[PDB]
Design an enzyme around this catalytic site. Structure first.
Site: not given
Ligand SMILES: *C(=O)[C@H](C[C@@H]1CCNC1=O)NC(=O)[C@H](CC1CCCCC1)NC(=O)c1cc2ccccc2[nH]1
Ligand SMILES: *C(=O)[C@H](C[C@@H]1CCNC1=O)NC(=O)[C@H](CC1CCCCC1)NC(=O)c1cc2ccccc2[nH]1
Lengths: 300, 298
Positions: A140, A142, A38
């Site tokens: 950040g 991930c 992603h």
């Molecule tokens: C990567 O660095 C982050 C790690 C998250 C951020 C905050 N705490 C964590 O563990 N990953 C994300 O932010 C994902 C990104 C998405 C991109 C497209 C594919 C799926 C992942 N998003 C989430 O983690 C997320 C989405 C979401 C929607 C509604 C309520 C909560 C929520 N959390």
């Protein structure tokens, strides 16, 4: 207490991967960098991404891979399930002996939380029966990985991808297959109802016996089937044959058969503790595996 | 919100094995000096009560076997600084990080890299108890394991492990070799002072529980600092100072909960108990997270 594996062998493998405005962490082993696919999403790509379509538009020169601030030139890219594999022109000299493993619910691992490719901390996690982990992940994080170490060999088992609305975390193995029923789309996903990790509670009871705290040992035994049917009524996981097997060494060390310990746990479930404690605690602990109990009582 | 240790890699590259007679433990290899507990030079009969300056003068450089991995390091010098032996070796450690030796205060936390035979085994977070013990996880052969903090790639070493008290808590020195607490490196059963709970840390952890969305322990009440300290002392909690209140400033701003409001919540928790409920998964009041630890993780 929860004890992480020393993290140095994994620290030497962490890099940062930037695609567009999104920077996350990658794992650099030999001449390949692994990271969540992603990273190629834009903020509007996330609701339902067509990753095959998004990747076709990308070229090697769209990927910024850095060890610290040193750029690693990307010479190839491919997608394996939900992980991007970026071939780079430099084999990581710090690559440990390693393997990629898919763990079972209940197994624990160390997480090296990383931000912009820089390790921030290390802590022990358990894979819950609903295939989430109670991580400590910020924006950040991930691409941070979970791992176990066995005699110089690092077994990578987890790569972090996302947080669920309940605040728990979901991710993949290092072949990009999500643990549990989750997908990498920014949609309403919820962790199913969690249960208690029975094999680990049993491990904890063995640990209590090893330390001389054994009032709960009773005069009963059970069949595995009988115990499983009762345990499920208390929101406990059923035991598998592999669970019985990994309790083998602790059963041998204490002389308490696994099914005798199951009958002891069954009594505790049906009757409570009566204000008594086990290892100085009124709660049954379920995040120590049989290996954790053994590792904590030996100098491995 | 979890107990998080610093990444141990910078310290792992400094761990070696030190052998003297039939005794093996760990040493810390920084530049061309290996630091280890001086009780490595004791024989089993000596451990009973040791005249260390006398036992050390009788030792030769070749009495000390130091191994880094499979490599053996030649000892070209040895000296004692309080309870720490300093072995000068003919090779500087090329993996030496930027480092400092610091003596920590009760209540402060650090990461422990538990090692056996010079090889790292696990890492976990500890706090210096008010009675100068630490609740560690150390087995036979763990002596010489170190505790540390990391700030922008500078390793601050604060603890070196020496012994386990009969109650199962642990005692050691700073890297100048001075024990934390009233303990002595003779093989005798030693009791600590009565331990107390680190109040400013319990409050930081309550704030951590708010930042992560559980608020069941909050209340509408407030308290003065002196009235809170009376109740805290009644329950064997350390005093809360105005410095502590200020240190909690950022967490109170983040949650909009004044510090004395959170003190009233902890007072209620102390007087009414937790009614079988749990906070951040724990059934007891956790006191090994400092305000910094909570800020750094949240
Ligand atoms: C990567 O660095 C982050 C790690 C998250 C951020 C905050 N705490 C964590 O563990 N990953 C994300 O932010 C994902 C990104 C998405 C991109 C497209 C594919 C799926 C992942 N998003 C989430 O983690 C997320 C989405 C979401 C929607 C509604 C309520 C909560 C929520 N959390
Ligand atoms: C070093 O590796 C060990 C670490 C101990 C062992 C078990 N768990 C630990 O943390 N250190 C020791 O064994 C010391 C040995 C020296 C202490 C200082 C002077 C010379 C011997 N001893 C103890 O930890 C110890 C001795 C003792 C006597 C009576 C009751 C408890 C007790 N603990």
């Amino acid at each position: 207490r929860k004890m992480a594996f020393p993290s140095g062998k994994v620290e030497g493998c962490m890099v940062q991967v930037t695609c567009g405005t999104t920077t996350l962490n990658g794992l650099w082993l030999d001449d390949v960098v692994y990271c969540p696919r992603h990273v190629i999403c834009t903020s509007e790509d996330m609701l339902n991404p067509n990753y095959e379509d998004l990747l076709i538009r990308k070229s090697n020169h769209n990927f910024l891979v850095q060890a610290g601030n040193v750029q690693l030139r990307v010479i190839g890219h491919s997608m394996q399930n939900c992980v991007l594999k970026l071939r780079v022109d430099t084999a990581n000299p710090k690559t440990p002996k390693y393997k990629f493993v898919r763990i079972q619910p209940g197994q624990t691992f160390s997480v090296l939380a990383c931000y912009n490719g820089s390790p921030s901390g290390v802590y022990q996690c358990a894979m819950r029966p609903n295939f989430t982990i109670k991580g400590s992940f910020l924006n950040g994080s991930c691409g941070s990985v979970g791992f176990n170490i066995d005699y110089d060999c690092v077994s990578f088992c987890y790569m972090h991808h996302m947080e669920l609305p309940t605040g728990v975390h979901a991710g993949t193995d290092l072949e990009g297959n999500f643990y549990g029923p989750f997908v990498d789309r920014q949609t309403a996903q919820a962790a199913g109802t969690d249960t208690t990790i029975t094999v680990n509670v049993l491990a904890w009871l063995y640990a209590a016996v090893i330390n001389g705290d054994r009032w709960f040992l009773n005069r009963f035994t059970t069949t595995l089937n009988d115990f499983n049917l009762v345990a499920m009524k208390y929101n406990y996981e059923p035991l598998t044959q592999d669970h019985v097997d990994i309790l083998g060494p602790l059963s041998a060390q204490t002389g308490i058969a696994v099914l005798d310990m199951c009958a002891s746990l069954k009594e505790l479930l049906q009757n409570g503790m009566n204000g008594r404690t086990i290892l100085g605690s009124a709660l049954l602990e379920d995040e120590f595996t049989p290996f954790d109990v053994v590792r904590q009582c030996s100098g491995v």
